[PDB]
Amino acid sequence: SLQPPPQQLIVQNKTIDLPAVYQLNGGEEANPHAVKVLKELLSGKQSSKKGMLISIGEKGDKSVRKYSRQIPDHKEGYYLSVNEKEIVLAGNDERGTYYALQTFAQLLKDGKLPEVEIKDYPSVRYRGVVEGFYGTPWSHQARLSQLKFYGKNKMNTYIYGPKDDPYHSAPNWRLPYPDKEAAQLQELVAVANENEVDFVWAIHPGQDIKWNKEDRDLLLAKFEKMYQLGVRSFAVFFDDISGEGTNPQKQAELLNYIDEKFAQVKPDINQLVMCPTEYNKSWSNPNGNYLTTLGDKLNPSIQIMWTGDRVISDITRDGISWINERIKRPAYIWWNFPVSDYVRDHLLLGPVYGNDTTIAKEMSGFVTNPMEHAESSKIAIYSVASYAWNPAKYDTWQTWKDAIRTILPSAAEELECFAMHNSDLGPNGHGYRREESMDIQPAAERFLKAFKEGKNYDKADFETLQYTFERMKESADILLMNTENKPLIVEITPWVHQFKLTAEMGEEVLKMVERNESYFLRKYNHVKALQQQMFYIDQTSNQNPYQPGVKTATRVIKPLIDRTFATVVKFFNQKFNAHLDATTDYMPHKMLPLQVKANRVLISPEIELDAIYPGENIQINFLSAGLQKAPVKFVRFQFVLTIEK
Numbered sequence: 244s245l246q247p248p249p250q251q252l253i254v255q256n257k258t259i260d261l262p263a264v265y266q267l268n269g270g271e272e273a274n275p276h277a278v279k280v281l282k283e284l285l286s287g288k289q290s291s292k293k294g295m296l297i298s299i300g301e302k303g304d305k306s307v308r309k310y311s312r313q314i315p316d317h318k319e320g321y322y323l324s325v326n327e328k329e330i331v332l333a334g335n336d337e338r339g340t341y342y343a344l345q346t347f348a349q350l351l352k353d354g355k356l357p358e359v360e361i362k363d364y365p366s367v368r369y370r371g372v373v374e375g376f377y378g379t380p381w382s383h384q385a386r387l388s389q390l391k392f393y394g395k396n397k398m399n400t401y402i403y404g405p406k407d408d409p410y411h412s413a414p415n416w417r418l419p420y421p422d423k424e425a426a427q428l429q430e431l432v433a434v435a436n437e438n439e440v441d442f443v444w445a446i447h448p449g450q451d452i453k454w455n456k457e458d459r460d461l462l463l464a465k466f467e468k469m470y471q472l473g474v475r476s477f478a479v480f481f482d483d484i485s486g487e488g489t490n491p492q493k494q495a496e497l498l499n500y501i502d503e504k505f506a507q508v509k510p511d512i513n514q515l516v517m518c519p520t521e522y523n524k525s526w527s528n529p530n531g532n533y534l535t536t537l538g539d540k541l542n543p544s545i546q547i548m549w550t551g552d553r554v555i556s557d558i559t560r561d562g563i564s565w566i567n568e569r570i571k572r573p574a575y576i577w578w579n580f581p582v583s584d585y586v587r588d589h590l591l592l593g594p595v596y597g598n599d600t601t602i603a604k605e606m607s608g609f610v611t612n613p614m615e616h617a618e619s620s621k622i623a624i625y626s627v628a629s630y631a632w633n634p635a636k637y638d639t640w641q642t643w644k645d646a647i648r649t650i651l652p653s654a655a656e657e658l659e660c661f662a663m664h665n666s667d668l669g670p671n672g673h674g675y676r677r678e679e680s681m682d683i684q685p686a687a688e689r690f691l692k693a694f695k696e697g698k699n700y701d702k703a704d705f706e707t708l709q710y711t712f713e714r715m716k717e718s719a720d721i722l723l724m725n726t727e728n729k730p731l732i733v734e735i736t737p738w739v740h741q742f743k744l745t746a747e748m749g750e751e752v753l754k755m756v757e758r759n760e761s762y763f764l765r766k767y768n769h770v771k772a773l774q775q776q777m778f779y780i781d782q783t784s785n786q787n788p789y790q791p792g793v794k795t796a797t798r799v800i801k802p803l804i805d806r807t808f809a810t811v812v813k814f815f816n817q818k819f820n821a822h823l824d825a826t827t828d829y830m831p832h833k834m835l836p837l838q839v840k841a842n843r844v845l846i847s848p849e850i851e852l853d854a855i856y857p858g859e860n861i862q863i864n865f866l867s868a869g870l871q872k873a874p875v876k877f878v879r880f881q882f883v884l885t886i887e888k
């Protein structure tokens with residue numbers, strides 16, 4: 244399964260051996276980045292004047308003259324051919340030759356090559372990743388791994404703009420990077436160049452920018468320092484700000500100045516991009532002059548970014564028409580998935596879908612804003628690369644499966660299992676949701692409906708739930724111990740622990756559904772302990788300020804387990820005249836369920852705590868009171884008690 248799939252492909256359903264002896268033509272004249280890859284593939288083998296011809300080069304080179312008519316007339320296009328007599332790897336340009344090689348590397352398996360002819364090129368000009376989220380910026384090592392991954396998947400764009408990098412945003416946007424970070428950035432740029440990726444350095448100055456000479460020059464001076472580090476593409480971001488920096492005439496004038504005094508003055512600058520203050524339809528004022536001013540005043544080589552109809556949204560024909568009419572050029576899409584910075588307790592590991600696949604001509608670029616979890620984001624990134632290169636042939640589920648097999652071949656099925664039940668965002672303020680657990684959703688819905696009603700459930704539905712919980716546990720334990728991609732396992736580990744507990748809880752609740760009073764009570768007590776363990780994980784892992792903790796299988800599996808538990812406990816309580824607690828989340832404090840978030844104890848919008856704590860403050864909203872470290876166990880009257888914990 245070639246990813247991205249080529250524009251055109253003819254296969255012969257024959258294979259040949261990769262030539263043990265070969266003659267290489269054009270090795271001195273072709274893209275050195277491409278020749279390096281070819282040479283690594285042919286290692287062990289060796290070149291002579293005999294043996295199979297392998298021709299590599301760009302249109303115009305001597306090596307590929309014979310094929311000049313077969314080379315697509317598109318930027319980054321290439322012609323590839325393998326038959327009994329020779330191998331052709333011919334780009335329309337240097338990047339095309341490299342892309343030819345990335346396809347060729349995928350064809351080669353166990354020293355054999357299929358006989359094929361490919362004519363290929365991207366449907367969207369700029370394809371890649373914007374590291375543009377809130378949260379811990381990607382590590383240096385993660386970024387090195389990302390750049391290599393993008394080369395392999397024909398992504399030509401990496402936009403560097405982590406919101407919490409102080410040299411990117413306010414106020415240290417004015418300051419050059421310190422030496423250590425500068426040497427790292429310099430290495431990232433070299434590695435990007437090696438993998439045919441435009442390293443685009445973004446700046447986010449709008450929150451405190453002054454529309455004067457001093458700040459303009461400081462911005463230019465910053466861009467110059469980035470240029471000295473090897474940066475050749477640049478962006479200015481005006482998103483998520485308020486105040487004078489939102490002025491569209493001034494934004495456009497600054498961007499045109501950068502264009503005219505910098506971009507068009509250096510020998511070798513590539514992309515110049517801006518993200519507008521009105522960057523999605525809902526945050527736009529259809530009766531305001533912001534977008535039309537940008538559209539009219541911004542120089543036509545400057546790109547303008549867009550997230551769609553909402554902050555988080557998928558791209559539609561009508562949605563992109565709306566923006567394109569105003570900005571007078573094709574939007575450069577900033578797709579906010581799988582970014583999880585507003586649902587930080589979730590991993591978003593499901594397929595990439597929802598974007599119109601017929602609108603390539605309506606977009607200048609398409610980049611995906613990922614999770615702060617770099618390796619985990621490769622599922623979506625791989626899929627986005629496939630979509631942007633060939634949207635007409637974009638296959639949601641096959642691409643997801645291909646991504647997973649590429650990222651973790653040693654445990655692909657296990658990672659599929661984990662990812663398939665870790666897809667949805669849960670309720671959020673952006674209203675954006677994804678499907679999850681859709682395979683078992685009907686079996687779950689029928690089981691629950693029957694059970695709650697006192698009608699009999701289908702045995703096969705019970706067994707499918709059983710099968711699911713079993714596979715979840717196998718998948719969790721195998722992933723925990725996997726050493727093929729350690730950085731990935733480090734990222735997902737807390738969710739993997741939570742996912743295993745979920746599956747164990749499901750097994751026990753199903754045993755509760757099935758014997759005698761004694762047995763039921765053993766199962767019940769086991770489930771209570773597992774709820775407590777899930778609490779401990781939710782309280783100790785991923786403790787960020789915004790959405791702390793660890794949620795998993797939230798769409799279908801957890802509600803099924805919880806509702807089944809509440810139901811069987813009710814039945815037991817009726818049958819045995821008992822008063823077993825049916826609550827589904829463990830809560831050590833007593834009172835709408837209470838919630839614990841960090842050192843906050845809140846009522847879901849008299850409380851007795853499990854101990855005496857020093858009080859910090861109380862916040863109510865139908866109000867606030869400093870508690871000045873006073874001992875507190877009881878609070879009697881949002882409704883949030885903060886304690887020292």
Ligand SMILES: CC(=O)N[C@H]1C(=O)N[C@H](CO)[C@@H](O)[C@@H]1O
Nearest residue numbers: 375376377482522554582584585
């Ligand atoms: C253009 C844009 O999307 N800006 C920000 C934004 O508005 N939302 C996403 C998702 O929270 C942020 O990561 C991103 O930095």
